[PDB]
Amino acid sequence: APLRVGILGFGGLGQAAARLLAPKQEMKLVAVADRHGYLYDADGIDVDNAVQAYTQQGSVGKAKKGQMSEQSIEDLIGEGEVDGYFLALPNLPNTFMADVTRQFIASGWQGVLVDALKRTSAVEQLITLREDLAQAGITYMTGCGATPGLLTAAAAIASQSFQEIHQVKITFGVGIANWEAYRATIREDIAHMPGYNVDKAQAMTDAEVAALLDQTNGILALEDMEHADDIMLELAGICHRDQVTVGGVVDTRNPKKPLSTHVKITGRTFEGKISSHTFTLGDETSMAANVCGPAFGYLKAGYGLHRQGLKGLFTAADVMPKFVR
Amino acid sequence: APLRVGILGFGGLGQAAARLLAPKQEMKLVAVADRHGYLYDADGIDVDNAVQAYTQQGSVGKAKKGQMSEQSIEDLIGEGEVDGYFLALPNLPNTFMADVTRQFIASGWQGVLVDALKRTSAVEQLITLREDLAQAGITYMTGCGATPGLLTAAAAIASQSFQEIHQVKITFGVGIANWEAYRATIREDIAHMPGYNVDKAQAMTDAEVAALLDQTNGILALEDMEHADDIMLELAGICHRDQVTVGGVVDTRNPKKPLSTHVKITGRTFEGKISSHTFTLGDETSMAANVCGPAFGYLKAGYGLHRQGLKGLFTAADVMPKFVR
Numbered sequence: 001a002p003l004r005v006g007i008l009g010f011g012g013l014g015q016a017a018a019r020l021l022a023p024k025q026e027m028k029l030v031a032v033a034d035r036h037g038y039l040y041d042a043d044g045i046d047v048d049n050a051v052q053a054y055t056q057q058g059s060v061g062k063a064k065k066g067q068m069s070e071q072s073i074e075d076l077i078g079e080g081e082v083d084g085y086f087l088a089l090p091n092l093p094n095t096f097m098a099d100v101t102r103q104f105i106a107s108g109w110q111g112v113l114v115d116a117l118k119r120t121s122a123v124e125q126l127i128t129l130r131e132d133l134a135q136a137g138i139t140y141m142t143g144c145g146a147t148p149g150l151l152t153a154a155a156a157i158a159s160q161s162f163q164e165i166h167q168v169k170i171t172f173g174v175g176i177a178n179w180e181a182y183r184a185t186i187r188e189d190i191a192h193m194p195g196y197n198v199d200k201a202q203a204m205t206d207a208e209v210a211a212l213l214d215q216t217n218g219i220l221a222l223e224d225m226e227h228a229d230d231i232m233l234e235l236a237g238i239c240h241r242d243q244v245t246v247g248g249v250v251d252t253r254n255p256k257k258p259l260s261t262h263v264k265i266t267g268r269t270f271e272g273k274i275s276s277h278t279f280t281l282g283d284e285t286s287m288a289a290n291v292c293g294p295a296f297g298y299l300k301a302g303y304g305l306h307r308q309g310l311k312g313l314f315t316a317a318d319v320m321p322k323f324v325r
Numbered sequence: 326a327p328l329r330v331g332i333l334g335f336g337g338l339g340q341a342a343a344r345l346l347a348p349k350q351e352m353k354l355v356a357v358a359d360r361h362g363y364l365y366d367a368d369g370i371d372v373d374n375a376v377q378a379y380t381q382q383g384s385v386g387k388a389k390k391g392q393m394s395e396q397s398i399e400d401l402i403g404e405g406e407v408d409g410y411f412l413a414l415p416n417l418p419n420t421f422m423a424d425v426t427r428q429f430i431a432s433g434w435q436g437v438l439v440d441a442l443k444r445t446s447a448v449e450q451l452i453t454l455r456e457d458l459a460q461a462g463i464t465y466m467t468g469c470g471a472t473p474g475l476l477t478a479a480a481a482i483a484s485q486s487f488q489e490i491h492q493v494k495i496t497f498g499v500g501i502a503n504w505e506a507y508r509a510t511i512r513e514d515i516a517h518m519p520g521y522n523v524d525k526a527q528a529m530t531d532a533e534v535a536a537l538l539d540q541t542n543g544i545l546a547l548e549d550m551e552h553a554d555d556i557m558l559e560l561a562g563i564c565h566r567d568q569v570t571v572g573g574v575v576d577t578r579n580p581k582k583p584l585s586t587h588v589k590i591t592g593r594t595f596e597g598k599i600s601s602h603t604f605t606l607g608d609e610t611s612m613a614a615n616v617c618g619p620a621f622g623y624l625k626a627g628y629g630l631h632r633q634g635l636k637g638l639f640t641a642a643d644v645m646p647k648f649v650r
């Protein structure tokens with residue numbers, strides 16, 4: 001009885017999430033939705049077919065068993081049996097994840113939701129929905145990506161050695177392999193550039209983008225970003241959000257990671273000695289793998305909590321993710 | 326309402342565990358026991374007084390409010406209100422932790438137990454007690470030290486990026502500051518030397534020890550050890566125990582850590598790329614801090630699970646520890 005799961009969003013992240021699920025024996029992808037269509041197959045999605053439909057014909061509604069629809073998310077919820085969904089949605093507008101969650105609250109569907117949100121303020125909009133989620137019978141796992149997520153959890157574990165936390169420093173690197181199937185979401189990173197914000201970045205043209213990325217050989221270096229690692233670690237009682245600082249480099253013109261992603265956790269131990277733990281990711285673990293891997297680990301953990309009748313909102317920092325086989 | 330906790334064992338580890346609890350506001354040490362005596366103080370232990378009694382007069386039963394007893398563990402259980410205990414016991418004989426747990430099962434006391442066991446086979450003896458523990462109303466957290474524990478949990482998190490795990494390699498270093506208050510437990514490490522075993526190591530004299538440690542300037546280099554990280558990660562469905570290999574260096578003649586403790590997690594991602602995550606501990610995080618810190622993090626996590634009516638046996642690999650303030 002493998003977990004029947006769905007993906008909402010079929011840009012680069014959701015496509016990678018679909019590929020990641022293929023060989024799992026204990027997780028079965030039955031449901032995808034994009035803006036313009038949805039695909040359900042209780043016997044398991046043809047990812048080849050769905051990625052074809054999307055990239056060639058603009059939506060998975062064009063897939064062999066696909067349905068076109070401007071209510072894809074509303075239609076797919078009531079369409080068949082899905083234990084959990086990964087919300088691989090961009091947060092555009094900044095309310096969209098919260099709005100999609102309100103559709104899930106409103107639908108009377110129960111089960112597990114996971115996101116890979118990045119921005120403190122989007123995670124806050126989901127905090128306000130804590131009781132709504134509980135009451136609806138939904139276990140919601142928020143910030144269960146790479147950062148927040150994998151790295152947030154690593155810091156939460158690392159923190160146990162210390163009487164007091166001083167700094168959680170996250171430095172991430174990202175190399176874009178395929179420009180096509182990232183330039184849909186590149187504006188989420190441009191929004192973290194100094195001078196910019198989501199509204200300004202989202203209104204930019206392919207031209208205004210390429211004109212910016214030309215200034216640096218396709219390198220976005222983003223400094224002290226709005227990253228929900230800060231509140232997740234604070235709700236877990238580890239440190240104040242202000243002691244969490246997140247920074248990153250994306251190389252748009254190189255598949256190779258421009259630096260080793262890591263989290264440095266600094267604190268003082270009970271003996272009054274000050275020291276740092278360091279969790280480093282392999283350079284050949286892609287963004288897709290470091291996001292979607294934890295995402296479905298959390299989805300499985302979420303189902304464990306859901307099954308025991310534990311509902312509400314959980315962060316990467318609160319629960320141990322479960323290896324999906 | 327801080328958690329009322331106890332320590333069983335007052336060698337080096339339990340003494341450090343007591344010091345670690347002092348400044349906590351949300352955890353109150355009310356109970357210690359050694360072989361020959363016990364100390365209870367519902368208003369909070371005088372650690373200065375207890376460490377004095379133990380080191381100077383041979384037992385904490387000699388402490389200001391102490392009681393001498395050859396049934397210290399049996400007497401302290403029924404003595405007052407304790408939410409959880411850290412079993413800072415050496416596993417000597419190899420059944421002792423399991424035997425103490427049977428006293429706890431038998432006592433009809435309910436709450437949280439945590440250990441920092443090291444040996445796969447001792448952790449197995451506690452697996453056999455799974456239902457006994459559940460039925461008794463006890464949440465038992467096993468292998469919640471440094472390794473197994475902190476490092477086991479780190480690997481469990483790290484594993485999420487990968488379709489398949491190849492190797493979990495743990496390399497640990499330990500520098501002994503105070504020879505006095507380690508030579509009580511040094512024989513647990515000597516047992517991992519090649520030729521040796523617990524029975525042979527435990528029968529050794531201060532002389533036979535010093536004659537061994539003289540051969541290497543006080544350096545035990547222990548290779549492919551029996552370490553319960555292997556079964557904990559297997560029960561968590563991450564990998565086979567045979568893909569977990571644990572090795573270490575203790576420098577008996579230097580407080581300074583003889584190498585950086587770390588865990589290397591190697592696997593293949595869904596894209597077929599092979600890579601390693603690396604979790605490294607600060608050189609100035611002591612053994613005491615890397616053991617007792619996670620131990621009480623797990624004790625708190627254990628109370629969270631206990632409070633929700635979740636009983637049975639949990640490993641470091643199964644649950645997120647909770648920062649104790």
Ligand SMILES: *[C@H](CCCCCC(=O)O)[C@H](C)N
Pocket residue numbers: 118146147172173174188189248250261281285286287288290
């Ligand atoms: C979010 C950060 C991507 C995570 C990097 C993880 C890794 O090292 O693979 C992006 C900037 N949208």
Ligand SMILES: *[C@H](CCCCCC(=O)O)[C@H](C)N
Pocket residue numbers: 443471472497498499513514573575586606610611612613615
């Ligand atoms: C168990 C290993 C001690 C853990 C080392 C952790 C660190 O780096 O502080 C000993 C060998 N009894």
